[PDB]
Paper text:
The GR is a ligand-regulated transcription factor (TF) that controls the expression of thousands of genes. GR has a domain structure common to the NR superfamily: an unstructured N-terminal domain, a zinc finger (ZnF)-containing DNA-binding domain (DBD), a hinge region and a ligand-binding domain. To modulate transcription, GR binds directly to DNA at canonical GBSs composed of two pseudo-palindromic hexameric repeats separated by a 3-bp spacer (5′-AGAACAnnnTGTTCT-3′). GR binds a canonical GBS as a dimer oriented in a head-to-head fashion.
Next, we biochemically characterize the extant human GR (hereafter GR, unless labeled otherwise) DBD bound to an unmethylated CpG-containing GBS (pre-GBS) and its methylated counterpart (5mC-GBS) and find that GR has preference for the 5mCpG GBS over the pre-GBS. Binding to the 5mC-GBS and pre-GBS showed Kd values of 131 and 206 nM, respectively. To determine how GR recognizes the 5mC-GBS and pre-GBS, we solved crystal structures of the GR DBD–5mC-GBS and GR DBD–pre-GBS complexes at a resolution of 2.0 and 2.5 Å, respectively. Both complexes crystallized in the C 1 2 1 space group and each structure contains a dimer of DBD protein molecules in the asymmetric unit. Crystal structures of these complexes reveal a specific van der Waals interaction between Arg447 in GR DBD and the methyl moiety in 5mC-GBS sequences, which is absent in the GR DBD–pre-GBS complex structure. We found that in the 5mC-GBS structure, Arg447 makes side-on hydrophobic contacts with the methyl group of the 5mC, mimicking interactions with a thymine base seen in extant GBSs. Without this interaction, Arg447 in monomer B moves outward but still makes hydrogen bonds with the guanine in CpG dinucleotide by one amide group, suggesting the methyl-derived side-on contact helps stabilize the Arg447. This gain of a hydrophobic contact could explain the increase in affinity from the unmodified pre-GBS to methylated pre-GBS. Each GR DBD monomer contacts the methylated pre-GBS with one more van der Waals contact than with an unmethylated pre-GBS, which results in larger buried solvent accessible surface area (BASA) between GR DBD and nucleotides in each half-palindromic site (140 Å2 versus 109 Å2 and 125 Å2 versus 115 Å2). We show that GR utilizes a similar methyl–Arg–G triad, suggesting that evolution has leveraged a readily available side-on interaction with the Arg residue engaged in recognizing the G base edge in a CpG dinucleotide.
Author numbering:
A (entry chain B): 419 to 489
B (entry chain A): 419 to 491
The structure:
Amino acid sequence: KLCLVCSDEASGCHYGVLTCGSCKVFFKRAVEGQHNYLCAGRNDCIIDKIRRKNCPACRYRKCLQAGMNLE
Amino acid sequence: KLCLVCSDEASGCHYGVLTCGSCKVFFKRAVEGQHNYLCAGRNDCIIDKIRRKNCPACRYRKCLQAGMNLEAR
DNA sequence: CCAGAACGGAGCGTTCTG
DNA sequence: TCAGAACGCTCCGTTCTG
Ligand SMILES: [Zn+2]
Ligand SMILES: [Zn+2]
Ligand SMILES: [Zn+2]
Ligand SMILES: [Zn+2]
């Protein structure tokens, strides 16, 4: 039902994890040509439908912790 | 010399406060439109040149705390 | 010197396709 | 089934104008 990264409504299983479409292509973009991501808080940001744009570092970390892989 | 919002190099006294150009146009954009920004941390994000884009909520709060206002004469 | 507009780049999220 | 391309919107920061 819900994206395992940002809790938005999931569209399917993308890169081995149940995610939404926005998290799908975010993860693809993050893995290619790393993007100089730095958290402004404590490496523990809240990632939800709105707040996910705030911290790509924490978003990317959550993607990996959920087990996203390009295969 | 240093922007009181993000500590980047200041470009002048803008909206009443010593700030850089980016914080100048950010504050103007924030006050004249919606500023319903949400912090994903604990409302104490580090705002500097590298991270000021991460949290508009905390950047706007630092603008207000430093005293920025549109009608600074 | 400063306010405001404008321009171009980056990041993001959707739609579309096979 | 889902991976990928591509378009357009938003946000940003520098340069330009008044
Ligand atoms: Zn998601
Ligand atoms: Zn974070
Ligand atoms: Zn600044
Ligand atoms: Zn914040």
